[PDB]
Design a protein around this motif. Structure first.
Motif, PDB file in Angstrom:
ATOM      1  N   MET D   1       7.080   4.435  -6.684  1.00  0.00           N
ATOM      2  CA  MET D   1       7.752   3.812  -7.818  1.00  0.00           C
ATOM      3  C   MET D   1       8.529   4.839  -8.631  1.00  0.00           C
ATOM      4  O   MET D   1       9.707   4.640  -8.949  1.00  0.00           O
ATOM      5  CB  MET D   1       6.736   3.095  -8.702  1.00  0.00           C
ATOM      6  N   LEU D   2       7.878   5.949  -8.981  1.00  0.00           N
ATOM      7  CA  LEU D   2       8.528   6.964  -9.801  1.00  0.00           C
ATOM      8  C   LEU D   2       9.692   7.609  -9.063  1.00  0.00           C
ATOM      9  O   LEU D   2      10.739   7.881  -9.661  1.00  0.00           O
ATOM     10  CB  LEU D   2       7.507   8.017 -10.236  1.00  0.00           C
ATOM     11  N   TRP D   4      11.554   6.237  -6.694  1.00  0.00           N
ATOM     12  CA  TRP D   4      12.651   5.279  -6.710  1.00  0.00           C
ATOM     13  C   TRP D   4      13.340   5.266  -8.066  1.00  0.00           C
ATOM     14  O   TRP D   4      14.573   5.292  -8.150  1.00  0.00           O
ATOM     15  CB  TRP D   4      12.146   3.880  -6.374  1.00  0.00           C
ATOM     16  N   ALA D   5      12.555   5.227  -9.145  1.00  0.00           N
ATOM     17  CA  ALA D   5      13.141   5.184 -10.480  1.00  0.00           C
ATOM     18  C   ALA D   5      14.024   6.400 -10.722  1.00  0.00           C
ATOM     19  O   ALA D   5      15.143   6.280 -11.230  1.00  0.00           O
ATOM     20  CB  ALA D   5      12.038   5.090 -11.533  1.00  0.00           C
ATOM     21  N   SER D   6      13.534   7.586 -10.358  1.00  0.00           N
ATOM     22  CA  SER D   6      14.339   8.795 -10.461  1.00  0.00           C
ATOM     23  C   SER D   6      15.510   8.808  -9.491  1.00  0.00           C
ATOM     24  O   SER D   6      16.442   9.594  -9.683  1.00  0.00           O
ATOM     25  CB  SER D   6      13.464  10.028 -10.228  1.00  0.00           C
ATOM     26  N   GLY D   7      15.485   7.966  -8.462  1.00  0.00           N
ATOM     27  CA  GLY D   7      16.544   7.943  -7.474  1.00  0.00           C
ATOM     28  C   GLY D   7      16.371   8.994  -6.400  1.00  0.00           C
ATOM     29  O   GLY D   7      17.302   9.749  -6.102  1.00  0.00           O
ATOM     30  N   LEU D  17      11.591  -2.651  -7.371  1.00  0.00           N
ATOM     31  CA  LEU D  17      10.228  -2.478  -6.887  1.00  0.00           C
ATOM     32  C   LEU D  17       9.238  -2.908  -7.960  1.00  0.00           C
ATOM     33  O   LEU D  17       8.914  -2.138  -8.868  1.00  0.00           O
ATOM     34  CB  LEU D  17       9.971  -1.025  -6.490  1.00  0.00           C
ATOM     35  N   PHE D  18       8.769  -4.148  -7.863  1.00  0.00           N
ATOM     36  CA  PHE D  18       7.882  -4.740  -8.860  1.00  0.00           C
ATOM     37  C   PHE D  18       6.440  -4.394  -8.513  1.00  0.00           C
ATOM     38  O   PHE D  18       5.807  -5.075  -7.705  1.00  0.00           O
ATOM     39  CB  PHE D  18       8.073  -6.252  -8.911  1.00  0.00           C
ATOM     40  N   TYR D  19       5.907  -3.340  -9.122  1.00  0.00           N
ATOM     41  CA  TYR D  19       4.497  -3.033  -8.930  1.00  0.00           C
ATOM     42  C   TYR D  19       3.643  -4.204  -9.392  1.00  0.00           C
ATOM     43  O   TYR D  19       3.844  -4.748 -10.479  1.00  0.00           O
ATOM     44  CB  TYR D  19       4.116  -1.768  -9.695  1.00  0.00           C
TER      45      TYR D  19
END
Ligand SMILES: Nc1ncnc2c1ncn2[C@@H]1O[C@H](COP(=O)(O)OP(=O)(O)OP(O)(O)=S)[C@@H](O)[C@H]1O
Ligand SMILES: [Mg+2]
Lengths: 212, 41, 54, 53
Positions: D1-2, D4-7, D17-19
């Motif tokens: 998740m992190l 992906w968020a950072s790219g 990406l819905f945890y």
């Protein structure tokens, strides 16, 4: 405990924390914190520090950017039975027939929710209230609204700050979103002999008063 | 309530704000008027 | 214009960047990028004798 | 998740990406995919007729 009892007068300098960058991220490219927890003994300066932060912000001496709606919310005053809704909780600390809420709460990225005396409600948090509102235009039930605000359901991206006596810690840790907490101590060694010079009128008073 | 973590979990370990304060409270226990704590002699 | 993708990415990156251990007194979180190693992933082909010998 | 968020992975492919933790999600009451997407989406209302489109 024991040494400070004796004199704790030995030279023990430390590295101090500042106040304007209390919400800045630990590193330099991480994410800024969205909760701080001041904790100290009973009557050590929590409320006076909250008032100082509020007045300094109002005068424009810290947090000029970041947020501009530091809503002081005392815990003792806020009784939790009736209907407390975030609209009313923002009106109370906002003198007007109607403060613009659909505009104030439209940017929760820029807000602070200074609180106080969370030890006033230790007893109050015991059963995980199933209903956790996520709106500011509803009858939020009071204590449930407070729990939702603590858990960051209401304005989840709205910064926070909670002062509290060290009486809960454990039960509180099940509600905080990894908050960066700060422990308060008081006046160290010279801050006292400077406090006397602010309480008393002149040197003639202060010198003898302190020496005594 | 200063809580100390040892090994894998932390425990409560309540404490007084200060040893002199605790001594003052002991003196108040003696002065004031009424498992068993130290004989009030 | 409102790249809600951007806003959601910022929120998730803020909320998923610290790992609190089991015995973590208040405000003792640790950054994932610091305390995150890389595990071993395998497309399972584990037989019975293989499992016992392992 | 992190990441992906950072790219750092899945830049393309998907961006939502819905945890969804299983323990937290109790299954008796009314869970609707709208609420399950709101919970992991800080907003008074996240655009669902656009996210799930
Ligand atoms: N920054 C300060 N400088 C000098 N004196 C202070 C300061 N802050 C507080 N005091 C003194 O301490 C008193 C109370 O401080 P507070 O921190 O408000 O106590 P308190 O912690 O709010 O009481 P509790 O614990 O919430 S019941 C005030 O009446 C002041 O006289
Ligand atoms: Mg206080």
């Amino acid at each position: 405990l024991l040494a400070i009892g004796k004199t704790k007068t030995c030279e023990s300098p430390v590295s101090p924390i500042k106040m304007e960058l209390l919400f800045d991220p630990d590193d330099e490219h991480s994410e800024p914190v969205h909760t701080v927890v001041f904790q100290g003994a009973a009557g050590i300066g929590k409320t006076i520090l909250a008032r100082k932060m509020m007045l300094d912000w109002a005068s424009g001496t810290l947090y000029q950017d970041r947020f501009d709606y530091l809503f002081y919310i005392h815990c003792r005053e806020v009784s939790l039975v009736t209907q407390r809704s975030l609209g009313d909780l923002i009106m109370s600390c906002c003198p007007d027939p109607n403060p613009p809420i659909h505009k104030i709460v439209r940017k929760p990225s820029r807000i602070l929710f200074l609180m106080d005396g969370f030890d006033e409600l230790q007893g109050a948090f015991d059963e995980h209230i199933g209903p956790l509102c996520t709106d500011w235009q509803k009858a939020e039930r009071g204590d449930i609204l407070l729990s939702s605000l603590i858990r960051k359901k209401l304005l989840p991206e709205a910064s926070l700050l909670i002062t509290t006596r060290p009486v809960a810690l454990e039960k509180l840790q099940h509600l905080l979103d990894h908050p960066r907490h700060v422990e308060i101590l008081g006046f160290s060694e010279a801050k006292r002999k400077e406090y006397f010079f602010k309480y008393f009128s002149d040197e003639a008073q202060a010198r003898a008063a302190f020496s005594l | 309530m200063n809580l100390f973590q040892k090994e894998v979990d932390c425990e409560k370990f309540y404490s007084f704000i200060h040893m002199t304060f605790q001594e003052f409270f002991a003196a108040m226990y003696y002065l004031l008027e009424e498992l068993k704590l130290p004989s009030r002699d | 214009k409102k790249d809600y993708r951007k806003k959601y990415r910022k929120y998730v990156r803020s909320r998923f960047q610290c790992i609190e251990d089991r015995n973590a007194r208040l405000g003792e979180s640790v950054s994932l990028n610091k305390r995150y190693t890389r595990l071993r992933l395998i497309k399972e082909h584990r037989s019975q004798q293989e499992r016992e010998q392992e």
